């Protein structure tokens, strides 16, 4: 029954997240950040809004979706670099 819409989502928040994830994903052994992962953020934000039975996706749904994807990427790493990546991406997640 429920079909959320991305009404007035924070584009630049997501775009900077994708740009930084892509830049740090240049590491040739890491999880391959790709355009379908950007779509994943948008799908996930819709899924959280679906859990709320919500016609509209909120910033909180999108922030949680970003946090899920960023955590998924950050933990896909050799431990020699995980702390630095956590520190860098914290500017996007620790606003929530």
């Amino acid at each position: 029954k429920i079909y959320p819409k991305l009404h007035q989502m924070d584009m630049d928040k997501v775009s900077r997240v994708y740009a930084d994830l892509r830049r740090e994903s240049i590491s040739t052994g890491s999880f391959p950040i790709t355009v379908r992962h950007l779509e994943s953020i948008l799908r996930i934000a819709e899924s959280f809004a679906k859990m709320r039975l919500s016609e509209f996706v909120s910033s909180y749904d999108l922030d949680r979706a970003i946090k899920v994807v960023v955590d998924s990427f950050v933990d896909a790493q050799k431990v020699s670099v995980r702390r630095q990546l956590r520190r860098s991406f914290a500017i996007y997640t620790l606003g929530h």
Binding site: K5, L6, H7, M9, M11, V14, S15, R16, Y18, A19, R22, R23, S25, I26, P32, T34, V35, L38, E39, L42
Partner: protein
């Protein structure tokens, strides 16, 4: 028309490996593709930002209005209009190359053949992509299609220009993929900020010999050297 899509072997295209290693398809079947595009992530930040803004405009649903605007503007056409138009071009027109276009295509063939010869000598290995006479037929075919868009009864020289541009943008990039001493001799002899005219470097190293221009290419790829002033001045710009 076979329009085929494939991933490289090893998943992402591996720049340290040859295209014949990155690709499972044999040279026989590869020759049958008039154009091969090898597509890679640049990972450039401005490109990825542009893609991200575009993708979010797709998901937010503005793209429906955007395409409708572009179609009312005539900057885009609908699927059915383009389908009818493709059928109209296919049934009404079949262009021929002008004599000037025919000579230009022949000269471009010998040009890219010379380019493949120097590349195969340089790499001392034969390419996975065969740039045989069969590939000139592909460039002819592309030229004819380009003229076929506008229903022009002749394919003019401009259509050969665009056909050559597309072949250079696709199959040539699919195909076109001791110095240790000369490079550091140049690092010693040319200090930072000053310029060496290429002709003197040619005389100086050849009199000791094509390792020269690989040393130029390597020091050009790094920031250390920068070809400058129509390529006549070798400028030690970086470290």
């Amino acid at each position: 028309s076979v329009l085929a899509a494939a991933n490289p072997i090893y998943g992402r295209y591996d720049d340290l490996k040859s295209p014949g290693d990155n690709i499972d398809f044999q040279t026989t079947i590869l020759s049958r593709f008039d154009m091969i595009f090898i597509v890679k992530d640049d990972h450039n930040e401005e490109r990825d930002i542009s893609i991200a803004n575009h993708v979010i405009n797709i998901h937010t649903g503005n793209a429906n209005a955007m395409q409708n605007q572009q179609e009312e503007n005539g900057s885009e056409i609908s699927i059915e209009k383009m389908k009818r138009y493709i059928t109209y071009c296919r049934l009404k027109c079949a262009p021929r190359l002008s004599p000037q276009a025919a000579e230009k295509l022949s000269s471009n063939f010998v040009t890219i053949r010379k380019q493949l010869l120097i590349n195969e000598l340089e790499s001392t290995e034969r390419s996975s992509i065969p740039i045989t006479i069969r590939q000139l037929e592909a460039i002819i075919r592309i030229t004819e299609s380009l003229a076929k868009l506008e229903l022009s009864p002749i394919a003019q020289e401009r259509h050969v220009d665009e056909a050559i541009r597309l072949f250079q943008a696709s199959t040539m990039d699919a195909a076109s993929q001791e110095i240790r001493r000369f490079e550091q001799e140049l690092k010693r002899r040319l200090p930072i900020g000053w310029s060496t005219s290429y002709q003197t470097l040619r005389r100086e190293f050849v009199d000791t010999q094509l390792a020269l221009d690989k040393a130029l290419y390597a020091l050009e790829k790094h920031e250390t050297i920068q070809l400058r002033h129509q390529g006549q001045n070798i400028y030690r710009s970086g470290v």
